[PDB]
Amino acid sequence: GSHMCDAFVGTWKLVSSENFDDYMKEVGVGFATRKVAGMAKPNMIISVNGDVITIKSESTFKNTEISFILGQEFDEVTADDRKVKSTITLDGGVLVHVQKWDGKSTTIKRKREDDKLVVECVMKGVTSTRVYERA
Ligand SMILES: O=c1cc(CCl)[nH]c2nc(-c3ccccc3)nn12
Protein backbone atom coordinates (compact mmCIF):
# COMPACT_ATOMS: atom_id res chain seq x y z
CA GLY A 1 0.00 0.00 0.00
CA SER A 2 0.87 3.67 -0.08
CA HIS A 3 -0.32 7.04 0.99
CA MET A 4 -1.19 7.78 -2.67
CA CYS A 5 -3.44 4.80 -2.97
CA ASP A 6 -5.31 5.34 0.22
CA ALA A 7 -5.88 9.03 -0.44
CA PHE A 8 -6.49 9.40 -4.11
CA VAL A 9 -7.09 6.16 -6.00
CA GLY A 10 -10.56 5.65 -7.41
CA THR A 11 -13.19 7.34 -9.47
CA TRP A 12 -14.29 10.86 -8.69
CA LYS A 13 -17.07 13.11 -9.94
CA LEU A 14 -17.14 16.90 -10.11
CA VAL A 15 -19.58 18.44 -7.64
CA SER A 16 -18.71 22.16 -7.64
CA SER A 17 -16.55 24.75 -9.35
CA GLU A 18 -15.45 28.27 -8.54
CA ASN A 19 -13.56 30.68 -10.82
CA PHE A 20 -12.80 28.12 -13.46
CA ASP A 21 -13.68 30.44 -16.32
CA ASP A 22 -11.40 33.10 -14.86
CA TYR A 23 -8.58 30.57 -14.47
CA MET A 24 -8.97 29.46 -18.05
CA LYS A 25 -8.92 33.09 -19.23
CA GLU A 26 -5.65 33.64 -17.38
CA VAL A 27 -4.18 30.50 -18.93
CA GLY A 28 -5.13 31.80 -22.36
CA VAL A 29 -7.93 29.41 -23.31
CA GLY A 30 -10.12 30.85 -26.08
CA PHE A 31 -13.80 31.68 -25.84
CA ALA A 32 -15.37 28.58 -27.42
CA THR A 33 -13.16 26.13 -25.62
CA ARG A 34 -13.79 27.92 -22.31
CA LYS A 35 -17.54 27.76 -22.80
CA VAL A 36 -17.66 24.07 -23.66
CA ALA A 37 -15.00 23.06 -21.11
CA GLY A 38 -16.72 25.06 -18.42
CA MET A 39 -19.95 23.12 -18.90
CA ALA A 40 -18.24 19.76 -18.54
CA LYS A 41 -18.82 17.63 -15.50
CA PRO A 42 -15.82 15.33 -15.66
CA ASN A 43 -15.26 12.03 -13.92
CA MET A 44 -11.65 11.73 -12.87
CA ILE A 45 -10.04 8.30 -12.45
CA ILE A 46 -6.78 7.98 -10.47
CA SER A 47 -4.93 4.72 -10.45
CA VAL A 48 -1.49 3.54 -9.30
CA ASN A 49 0.50 0.59 -10.61
CA GLY A 50 3.99 0.50 -9.06
CA ASP A 51 5.68 3.83 -9.55
CA VAL A 52 3.25 4.80 -12.38
CA ILE A 53 0.27 7.00 -11.58
CA THR A 54 -2.51 7.50 -14.13
CA ILE A 55 -5.01 10.36 -14.04
CA LYS A 56 -7.80 10.04 -16.60
CA SER A 57 -10.54 12.64 -17.13
CA GLU A 58 -13.65 11.66 -18.93
CA SER A 59 -16.20 14.25 -19.99
CA THR A 60 -18.46 15.20 -22.81
CA PHE A 61 -15.81 17.83 -23.81
CA LYS A 62 -12.59 15.85 -23.94
CA ASN A 63 -11.24 12.59 -22.62
CA THR A 64 -7.67 12.96 -21.38
CA GLU A 65 -5.18 10.63 -19.78
CA ILE A 66 -1.76 11.16 -18.29
CA SER A 67 0.59 8.57 -16.84
CA PHE A 68 3.69 9.59 -14.92
CA ILE A 69 6.24 8.86 -12.25
CA LEU A 70 6.52 11.39 -9.42
CA GLY A 71 9.40 13.81 -9.91
CA GLN A 72 9.92 12.88 -13.59
CA GLU A 73 9.09 15.42 -16.28
CA PHE A 74 6.81 14.43 -19.11
CA ASP A 75 5.21 15.99 -22.15
CA GLU A 76 1.46 16.61 -21.76
CA VAL A 77 -1.07 17.86 -24.33
CA THR A 78 -3.73 19.50 -22.18
CA ALA A 79 -7.46 19.38 -22.84
CA ASP A 80 -7.29 22.93 -24.26
CA ASP A 81 -4.43 21.86 -26.61
CA ARG A 82 -1.42 23.37 -24.92
CA LYS A 83 1.78 21.42 -25.36
CA VAL A 84 3.31 21.57 -21.92
CA LYS A 85 6.15 20.10 -19.90
CA SER A 86 4.72 18.68 -16.69
CA THR A 87 6.22 17.51 -13.43
CA ILE A 88 4.08 16.05 -10.62
CA THR A 89 5.32 15.55 -7.06
CA LEU A 90 3.76 14.44 -3.82
CA ASP A 91 4.49 17.08 -1.21
CA GLY A 92 3.18 16.67 2.26
CA GLY A 93 0.30 14.51 1.04
CA VAL A 94 -0.68 16.92 -1.82
CA LEU A 95 -0.20 16.07 -5.50
CA VAL A 96 1.44 19.14 -7.04
CA HIS A 97 1.38 19.37 -10.82
CA VAL A 98 3.40 22.09 -12.56
CA GLN A 99 2.91 22.77 -16.27
CA LYS A 100 5.43 24.86 -18.23
CA TRP A 101 4.89 26.20 -21.73
CA ASP A 102 5.78 29.33 -23.73
CA GLY A 103 7.62 30.78 -20.74
CA LYS A 104 4.42 30.47 -18.65
CA SER A 105 3.60 28.26 -15.69
CA THR A 106 0.49 27.00 -13.92
CA THR A 107 0.15 24.76 -10.86
CA ILE A 108 -2.62 22.31 -10.12
CA LYS A 109 -2.83 20.90 -6.59
CA ARG A 110 -4.97 17.86 -5.72
CA LYS A 111 -5.64 17.06 -2.07
CA ARG A 112 -8.05 15.21 0.16
CA GLU A 113 -10.31 17.16 2.42
CA ASP A 114 -12.85 15.17 4.35
CA ASP A 115 -14.61 12.93 1.74
CA LYS A 116 -13.71 15.35 -1.06
CA LEU A 117 -10.85 15.56 -3.50
CA VAL A 118 -10.17 19.29 -3.94
CA VAL A 119 -8.40 20.57 -7.04
CA GLU A 120 -6.86 24.02 -6.90
CA CYS A 121 -5.60 25.51 -10.14
CA VAL A 122 -3.49 28.63 -10.02
CA MET A 123 -2.38 30.90 -12.91
CA LYS A 124 -0.59 33.98 -11.76
CA GLY A 125 -2.86 35.25 -9.00
CA VAL A 126 -6.05 33.56 -10.16
CA THR A 127 -7.20 30.33 -8.36
CA SER A 128 -9.95 28.05 -9.28
CA THR A 129 -11.27 25.49 -6.80
CA ARG A 130 -12.95 22.34 -8.12
CA VAL A 131 -14.42 19.89 -5.65
CA TYR A 132 -14.85 16.17 -6.47
CA GLU A 133 -16.55 13.38 -4.51
CA ARG A 134 -16.35 9.62 -4.93
CA ALA A 135 -18.45 8.39 -7.79
O1 LIG B 1 -11.31 19.91 -12.76
C2 LIG B 1 -10.13 19.84 -12.99
C3 LIG B 1 -9.32 20.79 -13.71
C4 LIG B 1 -7.98 20.53 -13.91
C5 LIG B 1 -6.96 21.37 -14.60
CL6 LIG B 1 -7.58 22.63 -15.58
N7 LIG B 1 -7.38 19.37 -13.45
C8 LIG B 1 -8.10 18.49 -12.71
N9 LIG B 1 -7.72 17.32 -12.16
C10 LIG B 1 -8.91 16.88 -11.60
C11 LIG B 1 -8.98 15.63 -10.87
C12 LIG B 1 -10.06 15.41 -10.01
C13 LIG B 1 -10.13 14.22 -9.30
C14 LIG B 1 -9.13 13.29 -9.48
C15 LIG B 1 -8.05 13.50 -10.33
C16 LIG B 1 -7.96 14.69 -11.03
N17 LIG B 1 -9.98 17.71 -11.79
N18 LIG B 1 -9.48 18.72 -12.50
Q: In sequence order, what DSSP letters do the residues of 28-78 get, joined into one string? A: T--HHHHHHHHH---EEEEEEETTEEEEEEE-SS--EEEEEETT--EEEE-
* Tally of helices (H runs) and strands (E runs) in the chain: 3, 10
Q: Which residues are annotated as a binding site for a fatty acid?
A: 130-132
Burial class (CB in 10 A: 0-12, 13-18, 19+), 33: middle
In short, whether 95's Cβ falls inside 6 Å of ligand 1 is no
In short, whether 34's Cβ falls inside 6 Å of ligand 1 is: no
3-state helix, strand, coil in the chain (%, to 5): 15, 55, 25
Homologous superfamily assigned to 3-131: Calycin beta-barrel core domain (2.40.128.20)
Q: Which atom of ligand 1 is nearest to the CA of 55?
A: 15
> In residues, how long is the chain?
135
Does ligand 1 lie within 6 Å of residue 97's CB atom? no
Resolution attained, angstroms: 1.3
Solved how? X-ray
- Phi first, then psi, for residue 78 (nearest 5°) are -75, 170
